[PDB]
Amino acid sequence: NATTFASVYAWNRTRISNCVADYSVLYNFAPFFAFKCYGVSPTKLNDLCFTNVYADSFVIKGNEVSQIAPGQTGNIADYNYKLPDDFTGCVIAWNS
Amino acid sequence: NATTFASVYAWNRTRISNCVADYSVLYNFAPFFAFKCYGVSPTKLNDLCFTNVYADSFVIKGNEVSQIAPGQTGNIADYNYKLPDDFTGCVIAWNSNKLDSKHSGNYDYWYRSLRKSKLKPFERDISTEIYQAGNKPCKGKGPNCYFPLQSYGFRPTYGVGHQPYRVVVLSFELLHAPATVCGPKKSTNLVKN
Amino acid sequence: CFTNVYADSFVIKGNEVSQIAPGQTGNIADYNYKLPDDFTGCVIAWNS
Amino acid sequence: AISSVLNDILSRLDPPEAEVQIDRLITGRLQSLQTYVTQQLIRAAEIR
Amino acid sequence: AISSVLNDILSRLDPPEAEVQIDRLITGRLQSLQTYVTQQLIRAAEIR
Ligand SMILES: *[C@@H]1O[C@H](CO)[C@@H](O[C@@H]2O[C@H](CO)[C@@H](O)[C@H](O)[C@H]2NC(C)=O)[C@H](O)[C@H]1NC(C)=O
Ligand SMILES: *[C@@H]1O[C@H](CO)[C@@H](O)[C@H](O)[C@H]1NC(C)=O
Ligand SMILES: *[C@@H]1O[C@H](CO)[C@@H](O)[C@H](O)[C@H]1NC(C)=O
Structure with missing residues (x-):
């Protein structure tokens, strides 16, 4: 829910650890249109555990999503x- | 060999029975990225007799062979x-890059990614019904709703680890009385006492 | 300590290395x- | 093991793979023989 | 084995890998039971 998003060439990087990741809020997000997961089942995220998670946020064009x-x-x-x-x-x- | 094999979610299945199987012909194919026989030595395949053989052909990803x-x-x-x-x-x-890859993108091959529960062994799911996330009913594309079938998007420019892989599983039931498929070994005379 | 060491050397295609x-x-x-x-x-x- | 018949294990597997199944059968049958012999010794002492 | 708890093996490894650990547990516990029964038989002979 950040008001400002970093540029694609300067994509904002954040580290998340030592907390419980709730994906219910992510699922409840309406304007989502491109959700692709590789290597793990998207529905099994709430059960699978990891060491740390990295979030990289940026803004691109519509055709650049692929x-x-x-x-x-x-x-x-x-x-x-x-x-x-x-x-x-x-x-x-x-969409933004 | 054939020309086209169906997608993974609808893997092509055929039965082999009432014939003599000569597995030596398998050696005619050159590449053989993976040739793994579980419960039987490949060299011994020409000496046994199988009840009914089942051949399942499809196209798996580069790294999904394992x-x-x-x-x-x-x-x-x-x-x-x-x-x-x-x-x-x-x-x-x-490998099947020279046959199962399109420069503009080979989207004819699809795999299912969303389903309520894991399948039983040797089970095929051909339905393309949408998937519902949570308890909100789904009536089309939108939040908590996604198409279970995703295209592979095969491209020849991709790396070998992402190339399409033609995969065929030969599953046979061992000796349980009515053996039909038998090896090319020649029989002999019968002697008693 | 090894009794006798043998070295079988040849050249093969990479895909057949395994x-x-x-x-x-x-x-x-x-x-x-x-x-x-x-x-x-x-x-x-x-590789050579 | 895959089968309880040594002929069936040997006719369908290469030596290195058949070693494991043959060894599972060997271990099981040796255990059964040892159990039989121990029980027989105890019964022999009672009958003596 | 990885642990002495059947469920701990169950929810840590895939079936084909968990087979070996569960079989190790089975063999160990069967050896324990056989030892107990044999010792009981010997002691029962002495008490008889
Ligand atoms: C598996 O593929 C084989 C080979 O194509 C199919 O067997 C033949 O397929 C051709 C082409 O569609 C048909 O004209 C023949 O009638 C088929 N023969 C038989 C005996 O069925 C086979 O149908 C495929 N299996 C599945 C489940 O799709
Ligand atoms: C990303 O944005 C957050 C929120 O403003 C900020 O704290 C963080 O330093 C940013 N990270 C990078 C790598 O710019
Ligand atoms: C394999 O199929 C191709 C066409 O897809 C054909 O030209 C070739 O002869 C076939 N090989 C055989 C039948 O051994």
Whole structure:
């Protein structure tokens, strides 16, 4: 619910740990339109546990949404935000 | 060989029976990225007799080959194609970039990602009904509703670890009386006493 | 301390590198170089 | 083991893989034999 | 085994991997039971 979002080339990075992650609020979010998870079941997040979680927030174009995916190619992917091939996590995107 | 195999959520299945099986022909294929036989030595495959063989063909991801094994984890293993814990048969996986990849994107192959519960072993789910998250009823695309089937989006430019992999599982039931598929070994005369 | 050291050296395709292992299958293993069920030693493969 | 018949284990598995199943059968049958012999010794002492 | 609790093995490993640990527990507890019964039989002979 941050009022201001960082740029794609300067994507805001936050670390979250030592707390309980509630995904019910994330599910209840209405304007979400692009929810893709790789390596883990999205419905099993409430049960699976991890060490730490990293949140990277930015703003891109509508057609650039598909660029944010492992193994993808593009200007945003190559020179703005690159994901590992073995990425095990989720990506959420909503209109602004 | 064929020309096209269905998607994972609707894996093609055929039965082999009332014929002599010559597994040597399998060696004709070159790549053989994965050739893993559980419960039987491949070299011994020509000497036994199987009741009825079942061939299941589909196209799995580059890194999802390892999920085709008993008791495996992941969305593919327990959402689209689940092998029994007591599986007895062979698994073959070879690359298909030159045949199953489109430059604009091969979206003809789909896999299911959202479902209420994991499947039983050797169970196929072909329904494309939407998935509901929570208790709010779903009537279409929107919050808490998503299409269970997702396209692979295969592209030849992708790496080998993300290339499409043609995967075929040969599952056979061992000697339980009515053996039909038998090896190419020739019989001999019968001697008593 | 090893009684006698043997070095079998050859060149193979990269995709068949994993074929050099006891009990493995493949054209290289079946018709070129096969290791026994109780092989002891090491295998070193590097790109050339 | 996969089967209780040594012939069935040997006819369907390579040596290195069949070693495990044959060994499971060996361990089980040795345990059964040892149990039989111990019970027989106790019964023999009683009958003596 | 990884633990002496059946449920702890159950909710930590996949079925094929948990088979080995559960079988180790089964073998250990069967050995314990066989030892107890044999000792009871010997002591019962002495008491008889
Ligand atoms: C599995 O694929 C095979 C090979 O295509 C199918 O068997 C034949 O498929 C052709 C092409 O569709 C049909 O014309 C034949 O009639 C099929 N033969 C038989 C004996 O069925 C087979 O149908 C596929 N299995 C499934 C479940 O789709
Ligand atoms: C992201 O934004 C938060 C909230 O303003 C801020 O505390 C944090 O330092 C930012 N992180 C980066 C890497 O800019
Ligand atoms: C495999 O299929 C191709 C066409 O998809 C065909 O040209 C080729 O001969 C086939 N190989 C066989 C039948 O051995």
